[PDB]
Design a protein around this ligand. Sequence first.
Ligand SMILES: *[C@@H]1O[C@H](CO[C@@H]2O[C@@H](C)[C@@H](O)[C@@H](O)[C@@H]2O)[C@@H](O[C@@H]2O[C@H](CO)[C@@H](O[C@@H]3O[C@H](CO)[C@@H](O)[C@H](O)[C@@H]3O)[C@H](O)[C@H]2NC(C)=O)[C@H](O)[C@H]1NC(C)=O
Ligand SMILES: N=C(N)c1ccc(N2CCN(c3ccccc3)CC2)nc1
Length: 310
Amino acid sequence: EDCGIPESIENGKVEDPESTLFGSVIRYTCEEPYYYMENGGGGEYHCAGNGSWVNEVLGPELPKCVPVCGVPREPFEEIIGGSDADIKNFPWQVFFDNPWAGGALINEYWVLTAAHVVEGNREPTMYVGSTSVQTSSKMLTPEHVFIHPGWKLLEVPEGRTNFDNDIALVRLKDPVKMGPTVSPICLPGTSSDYNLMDGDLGLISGWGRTEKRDRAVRLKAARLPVAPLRKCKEVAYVFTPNMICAGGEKGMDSCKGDSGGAFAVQDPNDKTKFYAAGLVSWGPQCGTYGLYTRVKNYVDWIMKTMQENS
Ligand SMILES: *[C@@H]1O[C@H](CO[C@@H]2O[C@@H](C)[C@@H](O)[C@@H](O)[C@@H]2O)[C@@H](O[C@@H]2O[C@H](CO)[C@@H](O[C@@H]3O[C@H](CO)[C@@H](O)[C@H](O)[C@@H]3O)[C@H](O)[C@H]2NC(C)=O)[C@H](O)[C@H]1NC(C)=O
Ligand SMILES: N=C(N)c1ccc(N2CCN(c3ccccc3)CC2)nc1
């Protein structure tokens, strides 16, 4: 008759039941707003006659709580020409110290970044959860680096002129714990709703060079519009449809050290979510325009890489 004190789940909670005996009920809830319940129709279990807590969809199996993507706890208010940002405004931001660069957390086991950030480093050191840079808040241990196979490997990577396919995934050894300072960004969908248009606005964030300091100790961010690829060309370099051009306004721009950070765009179907439309890749002189890896063109590759390396 006794189903016993319910077992806990990661990133969820079950309230203490008044009774653990036959016919009692319990309800699992995920740690909101950072997690939600995957499928698992309701999280409600009754104590069955055979002594198991049973859910009508999952049977005796316990629910799974999974990260909510794209929703900062504090919206950004008002990198060249940027202003101070808090890691709570960009909780998906990852800091790489070798080399100095950024990335974007996309789920509890995966960081998205530019290929040129990890092309020289099989075991990149990464940090999340801090408005301030750091070296050796939470340090993330990598498990494996997956560089896109269309990225051209170079004997002398400085002086690259072909940044096509500038994208990489880093699988993490341990699941990242989400909270007010750490949470993933969403990915674009594959529908035409995610075809960026000239003038569409997004946010960039990073610790790269600013107009007054060679790097930034504390996070900066700026709002930037998409521009025709032509504008970037006009400022041997290769330009492809896998690159977004953005910038041109008020001298706001990404710069050296912002590499791999997300160009975060409000989701066209859910205005409260941000998705990674671009990754800081390369550009001409800082303070003009920048090129960003068009993440939408890689969603299939991203999904396949994660599925086959679970
Ligand atoms: C206790 O009994 C439950 C079944 O619950 C019984 O029926 C409910 C409709 C209610 O009336 C309850 O009050 C009643 O006691 C057993 O659950 C069953 O567990 C097995 C595995 O242990 C499940 O099989 C698996 O299902 C997955 C997903 O579908 C398959 O992929 C697997 O291959 C495997 O077959 C089975 O589906 C599940 N039954 C239900 C209805 O969910 C429970 O195991 C049992 N516990 C003990 C200790 O006896
Ligand atoms: N005007 C921008 N928005 C801009 C300017 C430069 C830039 N860079 C990052 C990539 N950099 C690099 C990295 C490895 C090898 C060779 C070059 C060059 C600097 N990013 C954006």
